Amino acid sequence: MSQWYELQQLDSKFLEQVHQLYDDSFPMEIRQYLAQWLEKQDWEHAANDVSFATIRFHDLLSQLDDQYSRFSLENNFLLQHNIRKSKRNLQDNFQEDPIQMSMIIYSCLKEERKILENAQRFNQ
Amino acid sequence: MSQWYELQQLDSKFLEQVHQLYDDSFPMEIRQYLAQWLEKQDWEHAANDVSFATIRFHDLLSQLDDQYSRFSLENNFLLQHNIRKSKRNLQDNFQEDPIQMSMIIYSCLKEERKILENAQRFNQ
Amino acid sequence: HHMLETLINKIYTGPLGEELVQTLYLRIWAMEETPESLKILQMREDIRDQVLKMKTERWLRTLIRGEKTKLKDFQKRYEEVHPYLMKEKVEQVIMEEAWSLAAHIVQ
Amino acid sequence: HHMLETLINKIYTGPLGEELVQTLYLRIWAMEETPESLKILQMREDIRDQVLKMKTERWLRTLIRGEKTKLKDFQKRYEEVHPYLMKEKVEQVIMEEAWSLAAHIVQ
Numbered sequence: 413m414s415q416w417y418e419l420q421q422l423d424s425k426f427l428e429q430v431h432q433l434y435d436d437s438f439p440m441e442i443r444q445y446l447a448q449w450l451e452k453q454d455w456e457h458a459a460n461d462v463s464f465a466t467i468r469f470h471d472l473l474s475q476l477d478d479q480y481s482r483f484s485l486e487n488n489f490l491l492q493h494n495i496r497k498s499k500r501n502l503q504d505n506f507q508e509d510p511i512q513m514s515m516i517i518y519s520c521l522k523e524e525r526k527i528l529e530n531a532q533r534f535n536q
Numbered sequence: 537m538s539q540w541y542e543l544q545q546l547d548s549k550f551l552e553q554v555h556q557l558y559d560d561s562f563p564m565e566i567r568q569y570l571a572q573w574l575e576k577q578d579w580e581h582a583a584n585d586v587s588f589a590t591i592r593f594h595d596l597l598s599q600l601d602d603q604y605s606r607f608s609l610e611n612n613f614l615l616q617h618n619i620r621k622s623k624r625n626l627q628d629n630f631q632e633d634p635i636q637m638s639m640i641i642y643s644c645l646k647e648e649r650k651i652l653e654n655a656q657r658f659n660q
Numbered sequence: 661h662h663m664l665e666t667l668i669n670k671i672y673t674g675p676l677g678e679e680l681v682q683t684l685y686l687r688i689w690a691m692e693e694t695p696e697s698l699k700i701l702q703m704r705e706d707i708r709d710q711v712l713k714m715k716t717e718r719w720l721r722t723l724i725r726g727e728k729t730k731l732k733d734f735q736k737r738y739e740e741v742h743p744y745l746m747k748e749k750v751e752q753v754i755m756e757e758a759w760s761l762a763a764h765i766v767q
Numbered sequence: 768h769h770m771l772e773t774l775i776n777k778i779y780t781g782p783l784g785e786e787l788v789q790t791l792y793l794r795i796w797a798m799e800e801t802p803e804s805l806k807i808l809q810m811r812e813d814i815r816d817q818v819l820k821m822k823t824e825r826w827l828r829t830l831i832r833g834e835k836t837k838l839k840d841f842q843k844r845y846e847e848v849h850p851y852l853m854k855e856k857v858e859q860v861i862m863e864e865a866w867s868l869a870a871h872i873v874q
């Protein structure tokens with residue numbers, strides 16, 4: 413039932429739009445691995461409140477630790493490595509001004525809904 | 537039987553060494569997805585011959601297209617996206633001096649064998 | 661390079677890309693067959709479309725690297741990959757279509 | 768930051784990291800239990816070791832960002848994350864051990 417799952421069922425024309433959305437904005441790997449958690453958070457509020465955005469930034473890093481422990485149980489060495497790279501890059505890219513990560517995440521989720529809007533309107 | 541497969545069977549102490557090896561050298565995603573093909577090529581010769589290294593660089597990009605078509609058949613939207621990102625980054629990072637990609641690949645495969653050497657010597 | 665990025669976006673989402681992949685499919689059908697042309701001709705249609713767009717992008721980024729690029733630079737970058745194209749006839753076809761698309765957006 | 772990178776490499780591959788994760792395991796056992804401390808205590812031992820090293824690295828990179836960092840800067844960066852640590856008691860424990868490791872390699 414996740415928005416991420418629904419996006420993946422669209423036709424290639426609209427999947428191409430999702431590709432372009434995730435060209436150097438927010439890492440699509442994290443968007444997928446934390447889909448359920450990301451889709452729960454009030455990124456709109458975080459995008460307008462530095463203290464809340466700071467908590468959500470560090471919440472996200474800890475959620476990636478939880479993902480890591482699942483992939484480790486699954487003996488998935490590459491995704492273990494990718495989770496660790498993902499965490500490092502997020503900290504490099506966003507820790508100085510974490511509110512900007514929330515602005516980007518909210519915006520991506522917004523654009524995803526607009527793409528879904530196209531797909532249901534185009535389907536008729 | 538691949539070297540990549542054998543590395544993943546090592547104990548966490550040695551997997552940590554593989555992590556450090558793939559910290560901003562060559563992308564581990566590509567190392568895994570093209571393990572069989574990468575382990576076949578004469579990267580040592582390519583690291584010493586610009587014209588051969590240039591062919592192998594473009595061979596690698598085309599092998600990523602072959603990987604993409606497999607993940608597409610598997611309906612794996614994230615890895616489709618990751619393959620495309622991988623190709624773009626390789627071209628950005630290495631197309632000006634493709635011989636340097638071969639030097640790095642050969643060196644990584646060398647360091648992997650040295651890590652394996654530790655693991656078999658430490659196991660006794 | 662701004663127009664390169666918009667050209668590529670047009671290839672993936674615009675009618676320009678639908679025209680590209682139909683041209684490529686027919687040219688790859690018409691070429692003397694290779695193992696590589698056969699596997700492309702045998703691909704499911706949506707996957708074939710994606711790969712052909714990606715293969716075209718690879719050559720566009722080969723011909724245009726940097727916003728500084730001028731059409732004078734095209735020839736060197738083509739000759740740099742010519743030995744590769746000699747053993748990859750399908751890529752030679754795709755490079756020709758990328759050349760035309762790229763020329764129309766550079767110097 | 769050079770010594771940060773070598774500190775982190777020591778944490779993942781050196782005896783310094785074995786000492787770190789044994790300290791953390793006992794401190795997390797000894798703390799008043801939370802859902803998060805219980806899930807860490809229930810992890811398979813090799814996975815727990817990896818997560819604890821990663822959790823320590825997260826705080827090291829919080830306290831040390833840039834080669835320019837001086838120990839004066841530690842206090843601001845700790846207070847910046849203090850409200851987070853208040854709702855994450857396990858992370859408070861790990862931050863204390865990262866603080867000691869980080870102080871010994873900065874100004």
Ligand SMILES: [Ca+2]
Nearest residue numbers: 692693694695
């Ligand atoms: Ca033939």
Ligand SMILES: [Ca+2]
Nearest residue numbers: 799800801802
């Ligand atoms: Ca309690």
